[PDB]
Amino acid sequence: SYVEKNLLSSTTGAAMVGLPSGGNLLQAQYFVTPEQFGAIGDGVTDDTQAILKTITFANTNNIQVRADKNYRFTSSIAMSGVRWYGGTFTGNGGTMISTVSCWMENVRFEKCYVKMLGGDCRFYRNIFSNATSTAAFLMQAMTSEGTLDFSYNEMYGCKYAILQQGTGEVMTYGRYSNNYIHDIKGDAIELNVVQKHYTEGLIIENNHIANVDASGQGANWGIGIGVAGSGPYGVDVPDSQYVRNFSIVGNRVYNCRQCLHVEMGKNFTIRDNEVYPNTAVSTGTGLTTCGVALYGCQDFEVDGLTGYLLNDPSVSTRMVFIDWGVNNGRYAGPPINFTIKNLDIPESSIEIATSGSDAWENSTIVSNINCNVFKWRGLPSSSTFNNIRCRSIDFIGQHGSGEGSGGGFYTRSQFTYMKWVGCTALSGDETTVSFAKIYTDRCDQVGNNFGVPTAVDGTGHRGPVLTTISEQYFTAYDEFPGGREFPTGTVIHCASGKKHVVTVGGAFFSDNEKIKATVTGQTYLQSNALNWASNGYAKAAGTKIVIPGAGANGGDLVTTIARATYVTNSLYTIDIADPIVTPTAENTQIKALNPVTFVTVN
């Protein structure tokens, strides 16, 4: 009639306790807890053996674990098939918990790390804090094929946060999404030599990363998000060496030396990421500071990039860096077949080194850019440049040895195509472009604020020599419009029916031009002879001019007209973009940097 103590305390004693359902308390045990196997959970007492017994019971009986205290442990723990919800694991700093086919939510991994060994693992709403192991979440030498969803976790205070080394059985599919990774000393997400993995997709999306500083650490530590296939680099190496079909989308990477990195990737997309590189972090690791660094990649797109560098522009403005690989220091594996678009990074610069050959196609597309320096090396079989707004262009087509990565390695004698449409090189009043070695068979160019010169690599080798006419103008008057630079081939049609054809691109300044005396520091010039408010002796802003003897130590000053003709103090006046250095005397001549030659028909 009464309850016996030894029956109530037995392993079936809970069956003696009724519940509102009409069932009993034994039927309510849908979980176990570590404390039932001897765990103290005070974060100090060594609970390793209790955790091991909990895992064995959970595995043996296929029952989930619930926990809420803090289990100090001091040697490796191996979990397989476990569902674990809640609690904190506290290691010695870098103590390992391995997982095969485990599902873990709401857990904190303090001063320890998880190593995934395979199966379908799922990690949601966990915290990985203060690991002193190489990585806080490691995939390495998996013993069975895996899939992974690693989402809505927070990671901080560690070295590497997420690290994969591709040796062993493959991860066939993985999603790394919506994680918050911050204040770390290695890489945030690094998937290294994983070319055999992710046949059914690698997606790294909407992760928020902040403060990645590997200063004092080893070589190449400190990347934000990195994905790497396997060398050797080379234009014709097998597809199987590359990591393929992956996507890096919607991530935010703040205060990191090299925010996004791919090497030996193929058929991938880097889409709509926001990056803030900083030269001041990860000092000594050898990484090129930038937002996106791609080495030896093929068949890829970069679409959508915002941000700027946190350091002063005098240290670096490099944001996009696309380069050849290197095998034992020798350039190899030019980037080919790629599309770069929607880079809204006006403070920051783009540096691309590519190539082109008769032995393989390389088609490049660059579109919808807003950047600082646009620097380019290499001459693809076809290259298009559309709606690029930049502050300067530094461009060599078939670059040679000493002119950038892989210079001199490949040439293309067959049909080579280029297009420039709707681009703008402008920094205030200055149009600053440099083009060379563009050995094209056809180059379409229209709508730009500059001309693109093309060149011939041996007589006859690019067909008949032609100059594209990119500018034509109508004037109501007959005199040649003064003070304005026109490219070679420009045609001016007059209302009278006369026509001017520019045979040497440049601007017209009369031989009778005279200016007033100038003093050091002056940024305006005034006419002492000609009517600068006439069309024939006009002065257009943006035109490059030379003021004899006004530069350093009586050299010639090359500058740009900053403001077109105006009258002040009863004198025709222009502003210049650079100050007088050496004073000049009354009735000095000004002239064009590039003096025009034209012929007039009728």
> Could you tell me which of 45, 93, 43 has the C-alpha nearest to residue 68?
43
Among 143, 327, 414, 434, binds a second copy (CB under 8 A): 414
Instruction: Sketch the per residue contact string, 280 through 309, with Sr ion: x for CB under 5 A, - otherwise.
Output: -------------------x----------
Instruction: Sketch the per residue contact string, 527 through 566, with a second copy: x for CB under 8 A, - otherwise.
Output: -----xxxxx-xxxxxx-----------------xxxxxx
Alpha-carbon distance of 295 to 233, in angstroms, equals: 9
What residues from 43 to 72 belong to the interface with a second copy (CB under 8 A)? 57, 61-64, 66-69
Separation of first and last alpha carbons in the chain? 128
Q: Is 277 helix (H, G, I), strand (E, B) or coil?
A: strand
Of the pair 583, 595, the CB lying nearest a second copy is at 595
Do residues 258 and 288 make contact, with C-beta atoms less than 8 angstroms apart? yes
Residue 267 found at the interface with Sr ion (CB under 5 A): yes
What residues from 120 to 159 belong to the interface with a second copy (CB under 8 A)? 122, 124-125, 147, 149, 151-152
Of the pair 297, 502, the CB lying nearest Sr ion is at 297
Segment interacting with Sr ion, rule: CB under 5 A, options 88-96, 438-446, 572-580, 583-591: 572-580
> Could you tell me which of 472, 509, 466, 465 has the C-alpha nearest to residue 487?
472
Provide, rounded to whole angstroms, the least separation between the CB of residue 288 and a second copy.
23
Alpha-carbon distance of 317 to 347, in angstroms, equals: 7
What residues from 94 to 113 belong to the interface with a second copy (CB under 8 A)? none
Segment interacting with a second copy, rule: CB under 8 A, options 110-118, 170-178, 221-229, 316-324: 170-178
Do residues 371 and 346 make contact, with C-beta atoms less than 8 angstroms apart? yes
Do residues 339 and 395 make contact, with C-beta atoms less than 8 angstroms apart? no
Report in angstroms the alpha-carbon separations of 491 from 32, 84, 487: 87, 78, 10
Q: What is the dihedral of CA 351, 310, 210, 292, to 10 degrees?
A: 0
What residues from 460 to 519 belong to the interface with a second copy (CB under 8 A)? 460-469, 472-476, 481-484, 488-489, 491, 493, 495-497, 499, 501, 503
Q: Which tokens is 387 given?
A: 């709606």
Q: Which tokens is 322 given?
A: 């696309």
Segment interacting with Sr ion, rule: CB under 5 A, options 54-62, 413-421, 453-461, 571-579: 571-579
What residues from 347 to 366 belong to the interface with Sr ion (CB under 5 A)? none
Of the pair 279, 342, the CB lying nearest Cl ion is at 279
Q: Is 282 helix (H, G, I), strand (E, B) or coil?
A: coil
Provide, rounded to whole angstroms, the least separation between the CB of residue 114 and a second copy.
19
What residues from 260 to 299 belong to the interface with a second copy (CB under 8 A)? 267, 269, 271-272, 274, 276
Residue 257 found at the interface with a second copy (CB under 8 A): no
Residue 451 found at the interface with a second copy (CB under 8 A): no
Alpha-carbon distance of 161 to 233, in angstroms, equals: 27
Of the pair 38, 313, the CB lying nearest Cl ion is at 313
Q: Which tokens is 567 given?
A: 């009258």
* Cis status, amide bond into 20, omega within 30 of 0: no
The listed partner (Cl ion, a second copy, Sr ion, none) that binds 245, CB under 5 to 8 Å by sort, is: a second copy
Alpha-carbon distance of 551 to 542, in angstroms, equals: 19
Q: What region, left, alpha or beta, does residue 528 occupy, with left being phi > 0 and alpha being psi -120 to 50 degrees?
A: alpha
Q: Are β-strands 290-295 and 318-323 bridged in parallel, bridged antiparallel, or unpaired?
A: parallel
Of the pair 236, 329, the CB lying nearest a second copy is at 236
Provide, rounded to whole angstroms, the least separation between the CB of residue 455 and a second copy.
14
Of the pair 49, 267, the CB lying nearest Sr ion is at 267
What residues from 205 to 224 belong to the interface with a second copy (CB under 8 A)? 205-206, 208, 210-211
Judged on CB neighbours under 10 Å (0-12, 13-18, 19+), 113 is buried
Alpha-carbon distance of 173 to 538, in angstroms, equals: 67
Among 577, 581, 592, 596, binds Sr ion (CB under 5 A): 577
Of the pair 368, 467, the CB lying nearest Sr ion is at 368
The listed partner (Cl ion, Sr ion, a second copy, none) that binds 332, CB under 5 to 8 Å by sort, is: Cl ion
Which residues sit at the interface with Sr ion, rule CB under 5 A? 267, 299, 577
